[model samples]
Target: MINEIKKDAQERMDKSVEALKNNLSKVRTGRAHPSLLSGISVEYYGAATPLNQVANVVAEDARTLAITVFDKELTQKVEKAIMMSDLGLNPMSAGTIIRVPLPPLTEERRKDLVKIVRGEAEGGRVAVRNIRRDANNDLKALLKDKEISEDEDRKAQEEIQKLTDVAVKKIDEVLAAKEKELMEV
Candidate 1:
């Protein structure tokens, strides 16, 4: 039973860390990367669709992204969608192709991104700690019901704390790497 609780807590912590990774990937850095536009959606047939579905996105260079629209008519739509996106990108359209040039981040912008990364890391750590709290509560409930001894509950709580610590450490590592990437000129 204690093992089951630990396994569940560990799994939850893993998911929290993975979520942090996904969120961080969406945060733009200095270089042009395809994942930067992964969150943007474009209108297709009056329905909202992911940008990748209607067009192919590739890095034309270290500072530029090339979006090849599958349909000739969708170029304008794609350009419009990209310009409206919150990424602050400027997409220039030429017939069926759109070229997006990534502007260099100012020092102040890099600092802001670092703060956002820090906030995301903190959110992940909080989620892991919350899972630990739930596991500890479960252990306490088992003790109250005489299903687990006092010693067993103490050991289980310690194990959960260790899991929490490891998960928080992972978040810190990811945040540090992203901050370094952002601060790079």
Candidate 2:
């Protein structure tokens, strides 16, 4: 039920899925997400911050994302850095805001976003698998050491599979949401 081995597996599985849930946050590129420019950094007098930190990104239109700079002086710098970064983007400024025009999406690695998403989901499962295997080994040790009877070990294994199933479903849901997000463009 709640042996030391089972508890460890439970916590590790919980955190394992939890980690992936947040990992997806750090990866993105869909429609006109703030992530589009979130990775671009501009140096403000030896201080560097990504666009997400210093500006607000919004979809100005289907073909454009507008970057509203927090600092007036940093406004032009955003345009310059963006142009130089090889995204080949051309943004027009309206004093404090920069409007970036995104090209029509067709084959420019949009599906590739799912590649990374799928990869992470697999890694989550791997982590869950590992937790199961470790707990299984520990349960085996408990049997060998005469700390638990046979039924105790068997029950723990069954419980682990249940957690595994729930965690996998959680991972799948996360992946599906991200797939929708990336394809929204």
Candidate 3:
């Protein structure tokens, strides 16, 4: 039973790390990434559709994302959706294609983005801790039921706690590296 609890906690911690990876992909790194458009959705045929479905997004340069809509009729609406979005990109339309340019971040803006990244990393840590708490609760329940010897239970619990700590520490390391990358000129 203790082993099962440890396994569950390890699995949850792994999931937390995966979530952090996905969240960090959305953070801007002073360059245009194709993933930036991964969150963009537009109204298409009365249904919300991701921008990638209706158009092709290509990085023309470090600062530019060129979108070519497969359907010419949606060109204006696609441009409008991008303009209304808070990515700060201005969409330029030329016939069937639209160009979105990402502006360089000012020093102040870079610091602000660092703060955002810090917040995200903190959330990731909290999530991992929450998983630890849940696993600990399960172990406590097993102990109450006299499912295992106290000595064995204590060792398993300590190992699980160590696992949680290591996962959170890894998240902190990743955050520090990303923060340094963001703060670098």
Whichever of 2 and 3 has more TM-score, that candidate is 3
Local accuracy by lDDT, each model: 0.90, 0.79, 0.84
Q: For residues 7-99, could you state the per-residue lDDT of candidate 2 as single tens digits?
A: 788789889888897778656443455555656899987988777777888887655689999999899998888887776567889888998
How does residue 89 of candidate 2 score in lDDT? 69
RMSD of each: 2.0, 3.6, 2.4
Which residue pairs in model 3 clash with each other?
Answer: none
Ranking by TM-score: 1, 3, 2
Candidate 2's C-alpha runs over 4 A off are 1-7, 18-29, 35-38, 57-65, 80-92, 100-104, 181-185
lDDT by residue (42-84, candidate 1, tens digit) is 7788899998898999999988899999999889988988888
Candidate 2 vs 3: which has more lDDT: 3
Q: Which candidate is the best by lDDT?
A: 1
State the lDDT of candidate 3 residue by residue for 43-124, as single tens digits. 8989999988999988889778889998989999889888777777778999888988877678988988888888988999
- Top TM-score hit: 1
Once fitted onto the true fold, the runs of candidate 3 whose alpha carbons sit more than 4 angstroms away are: none
